Design a binder for this molecule. Structure first.
Ligand SMILES: NC(=O)c1ccc[n+]([C@@H]2O[C@H](COP(=O)([O-])OP(=O)(O)OC[C@H]3O[C@@H](n4cnc5c(N)ncnc54)[C@H](O)[C@@H]3O)[C@@H](O)[C@H]2O)c1
Ligand SMILES: Nc1nc2c(ncn2[C@@H]2O[C@H](COP(=O)(O)OP(=O)(O)OP(=O)(O)O)[C@@H](O)[C@H]2O)c(=O)[nH]1
Ligand SMILES: Nc1nc2c(ncn2[C@@H]2O[C@H](COP(=O)(O)OP(=O)(O)OP(=O)(O)O)[C@@H](O)[C@H]2O)c(=O)[nH]1
Ligand SMILES: Nc1nc2c(ncn2[C@@H]2O[C@H](COP(=O)(O)OP(=O)(O)OP(=O)(O)O)[C@@H](O)[C@H]2O)c(=O)[nH]1
Ligand SMILES: Nc1nc2c(ncn2[C@@H]2O[C@H](COP(=O)(O)OP(=O)(O)OP(=O)(O)O)[C@@H](O)[C@H]2O)c(=O)[nH]1
Ligand SMILES: Nc1ncnc2c1ncn2[C@@H]1O[C@H](COP(=O)(O)OP(=O)(O)OP(=O)(O)O)[C@@H](O)[C@H]1O
Ligand SMILES: O=c1[nH]cnc2c1ncn2[C@@H]1O[C@H](COP(=O)(O)O)[C@@H](O)[C@H]1O
Ligand SMILES: O=c1[nH]cnc2c1ncn2[C@@H]1O[C@H](COP(=O)(O)O)[C@@H](O)[C@H]1O
Ligand SMILES: O=c1[nH]cnc2c1ncn2[C@@H]1O[C@H](COP(=O)(O)O)[C@@H](O)[C@H]1O
Lengths: 481, 131, 81, 71, 87
């Protein structure tokens, strides 16, 4: 009736100071009494903001133009916009990430009935948006005249727009002050979807579109804030002129910012956390790269709402070998997540993650989320271009410190296809390995971590040469993706 | 000697060395003596060990071009002091005081964690040190 | 108000005789309250001689003819022939 | 173009050409524009083709350092 | 390609012909007595979803109405005459 406990507990590993990383250990299997896809993944990003899935795209220029932010926020995660570009560009990026799906659209493009129809085609090319309401003065402060539609422009141009729009007598509409559950039903039951909202004075105040009900059906896991639009993040630097960049990003409606730094503990960074949290009380803020609890204290005292952790460990990085300063990633994530947990702040494990097993390890060590670089580079919506080189469809991967001194390299990665199929493979690999561990949710997994129920063993170098070994002539993987 | 990146210079200084001394890292700079030969498509310059021609206790090899030492030494200086900033020391004298006072703290980097930065996780790459 | 000390001190590394080299260890980061180019580098070479920078060229025949001694002494260091 | 050695220059002059125009043989000299990067232990400098970014009719590559055009 | 059973190759060439059309001459059609879960079945089986309704559920019958993907945003169970648009 007694079975000996086997394997080192969580704390017994990182007592002997050998500086372990994700390769150096395993997690012993448990007991299974649930289906592989039953388990929950809800995870905090910062004190007030929570995600339906623990995946984040890294704010590198070679990873996160707006198209990845969209395609990752649509599947639980969150996307941080790279900062090494002019503030006006970064504000535009975060603006068109916010506007991909909407609740009450509160600032539509609208037109006066006197326009030429070639100006509708101009607006459609300039905005992508194409089902436009018409008002007498061509602004929100006017009576509703009609709607014009992509379905109205199958016809050279030249016509005055009142000839081709559909008029206010014939379209359906709802009264203002309606909540976004009755207006939704009224659009569903008036089965022709572009329903405008007007006050009792019959003037335009907002509109709703069926396409976003279609997006809600299609992407049930997407992370949307109170106004029912995608959550968006920006990196910003710590410099005196990023104080201007902040205002444009906030006027564009960013929800979270990460104070991007190689070494988070600086007096410049701690002063900037105060400036952000005094001027803009709503914004959640994430602290710059820390590796030891002795430097997490300054960030949490400043008022930061989460931390990102790890330095010099990374694929593209060379900071350990230029600065001499760093810490092995597996030790760092645990030894700071145990401390930061006392104050209730989340931790996000920053980079050095190159297979699904490294994500399950990072989460079973106290990280509230992981953050991805190379594993999302060369997906379809990672920005730029592909070039065939020595017969491989590879796409660039630039480190920010890679062009006073250079502390990253610049390189390239083979194609991985659309992030829309890749993220579900990470989710179905994490939750399927969380089954073998024996945890019904990630909150239960970190409870097992801190209770001693999980048990690890050190994988000596001779045992790292296991799986896909020096015991095949040649081989092919095929992750179903 | 045994110093082959700016991180090894900061480690040697934060361990009690008053100075470092360079070999291979200054070989194939412009004012290192002799001549360049293109070999297998590389503008490399000779590197001879003094024990490499009674027994031989050094090899004779070659190193790729690093340009003028007049730009290379400021890159070493601006890499040392920029890493001494991350350590938290305002001078090398303060750094060795931290060494001998216990304020500096190290960790052992197990072999698996030496495979970090510029890793087995890229197809191919180019560094571009400012040099 | 208390934060646990993390990491081996200087002496605790080289007590266990595993013969570490520069690759085998890291230096944990501290607190930053100065600009990266503020730091001083003045370093002794020998009891009576001090240099504005801690770099020396090795006295190998393949490294130090006079032209390197000049170009390195001109930038803080020193050159051995 | 297609000149990649001194012998090809002499052949091109002894065939009628009044002068010879050099591409690759002057790339990666010191005053060719841009930057040098270590790829695989080589101090090489970029060599972009104009038809290498509608279709692409050139490649983009790199060449090992040749020192000053003055020598 | 021909190295597969004739029935498969006939299906392939059939669904290559039917990707765009002039007068669709043999559409999928339904009787107004069907359950709406059979419209979802037909949409999954054919990809085509804007389906006309006729009294005997075949081309040899009077029109009754049309059903479209815009009519299936709602468990199933309903008789199809409740949710069509009528003739
Ligand atoms: N872990 C990493 O190493 C890592 C990760 C992601 C990005 N990066 C990138 O690498 C660069 C590394 O430098 P950094 O992280 O110190 O940020 P940085 O680029 O803003 O700082 C550059 C230099 O100026 C100093 N500095 C920073 N803010 C300052 C201020 N307000 N006033 C005065 N001096 C200031 C820093 O000490 C540093 O020496 C960053 O630009 C960052 O985008 C590094
Ligand atoms: N016009 C519009 N309506 C939405 C959108 N998203 C959700 N709705 C619906 O509006 C309602 C939102 O109110 P809530 O009750 O807080 O949201 P919910 O019930 O949790 O539904 P989900 O957030 O989609 O999981 C739900 O019925 C949603 O299905 C959207 O993006 N646009
Ligand atoms: N109404 C409106 N939607 C906008 C605007 N900017 C972005 N959008 C988003 O764009 C989505 C799709 O636009 P639709 O006009 O519905 O697209 P569509 O013309 O019907 O054609 P499809 O794209 O084929 O559905 C909307 O549901 C909004 O989420 C804007 O100014 N007005
Ligand atoms: N319902 C339907 N109508 C079409 C289709 N293709 C073309 N039409 C239109 O029906 C007419 C076909 O008659 P034709 O005069 O012989 O074709 P066309 O003028 O050469 O036009 P294209 O073949 O499209 O270049 C044209 O107006 C076409 O634009 C189709 O695929 N479906
Ligand atoms: N009408 C009809 N079209 C068919 C059939 N089989 C294939 N198709 C083709 O499928 C095309 C698109 O089908 P639609 O019914 O228009 O697609 P939809 O369901 O309205 O939805 P969208 O694809 O979003 O426009 C048609 O235009 C035909 O070319 C069939 O049995 N009937
Ligand atoms: N509120 C409304 N009430 C009724 N009809 C409307 C309303 N708004 C637009 N319409 C009209 O109904 C028709 C269908 O509009 P809808 O918005 O569904 O077209 P659409 O989605 O742009 O078409 P498509 O997908 O083919 O591009 C058009 O003639 C349009 O002008
Ligand atoms: O140039 C650089 N120098 C140092 N660290 C960088 C640089 N660029 C990116 N990083 C780090 O690399 C991570 C990307 O994840 P990775 O691909 O696993 O290495 C980022 O999130 C940063 O932490
Ligand atoms: O022939 C040799 N045998 C052994 N050591 C040598 C020889 N020549 C030079 N050295 C050492 O190599 C150092 C040069 O630095 P290195 O390039 O890092 O090896 C010199 O300063 C000497 O300590
Ligand atoms: O992108 C390109 N496509 C085609 N020809 C080019 C391109 N760029 C330059 N050229 C030509 O190619 C020659 C290259 O010279 P070479 O490198 O010495 O062979 C140039 O002198 C031009 O005549």
């Amino acid at each position: 009736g007694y079975v000996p406990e086997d394997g080192l507990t969580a704390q017994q590993l990182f007592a002997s100071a050998d500086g372990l990383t994700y390769n150096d250990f395993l997690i012993l299997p448990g007991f299974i009494d649930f289906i592989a896809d039953e388990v929950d993944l809800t995870s905090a990003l910062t004190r007030k903001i929570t995600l339906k899935t623990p995946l984040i795209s890294s704010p590198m220029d070679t990873v996160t133009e707006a198209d990845m932010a969209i395609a990752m926020a649509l599947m639980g995660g969150i996307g941080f916009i790279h900062h090494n570009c002019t503030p006006e560009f970064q504000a535009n990026e975060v603006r068109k990430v916010k506007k991909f799906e909407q609740g009450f659209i509160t600032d539509p493009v609208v037109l006066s009935p006197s326009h030429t129809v070639g100006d509708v085609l101009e607006a459609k090319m300039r905005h992508g948006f194409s089902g436009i309401p018409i008002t007498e003065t061509g602004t929100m402060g006017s009576k509703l005249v009609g709607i014009v539609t992509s379905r109205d422009i199958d016809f050279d141009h030249t016509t005055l727009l009142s000839e081709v729009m559909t008029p206010r007598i014939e379209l359906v509409v709802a009264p203002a002050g309606v909540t976004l559950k009755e207006a939704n039903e009224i659009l569903q039951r008036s089965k022709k979807g572009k329903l405008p909202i007007v006050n009792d004075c019959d003037e335009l105040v907002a509109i709703i579109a069926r396409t976003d009900l279609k997006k809600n059906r299609d992407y049930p896991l997407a992370s949307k804030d109170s106004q029912k639009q995608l959550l968006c993040g920006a990196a910003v630097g710590t410099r005196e002129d990023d104080k201007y960049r902040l205002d444009l990003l906030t006027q564009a409606g960013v929800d979270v910012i990460v104070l991007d730094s190689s070494q988070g503990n600086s007096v410049y960074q701690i002063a900037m956390v105060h400036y952000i949290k005094q001027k803009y009380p709503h914004l959640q803020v994430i602290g710059g790269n820390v590796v030891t609890a002795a430097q997490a204290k300054n960030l949490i005292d400043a008022g930061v709402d989460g931390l990102r952790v790890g330095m010099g460990c990374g694929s593209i990085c060379i900071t350990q070998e230029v600065m001499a300063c760093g810490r092995p990633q597996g030790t760092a994530v645990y030894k700071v997540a145990e401390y930061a947990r006392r104050f209730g702040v989340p931790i996000i494990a920053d980079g050095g993650i190159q297979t699904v097993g490294h994500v399950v390890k990072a989460l079973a060590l106290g990280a509230s989320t992981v953050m991805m670089g190379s594993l999302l580079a060369a997906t379809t919506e990672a920005p730029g271009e592909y070039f065939f080189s020595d017969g491989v469809r590879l796409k660039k991967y630039r480190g920010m410190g890679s062009l006073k001194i250079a502390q990253g390299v610049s390189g390239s990665i083979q194609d991985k296809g659309s992030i829309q199929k890749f993220v579900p493979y990470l989710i179905a690999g994490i939750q399927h390995g969380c089954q073998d561990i024996g945890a019904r949710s990630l909150s239960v997994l970190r409870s097992m971590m801190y209770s001693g129920e999980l048990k690890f063993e050190k994988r000596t170098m001779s045992a790292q040469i296991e799986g896909g070994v020096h015991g095949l002539h040649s081989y092919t993987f095929l992750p179903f993706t």
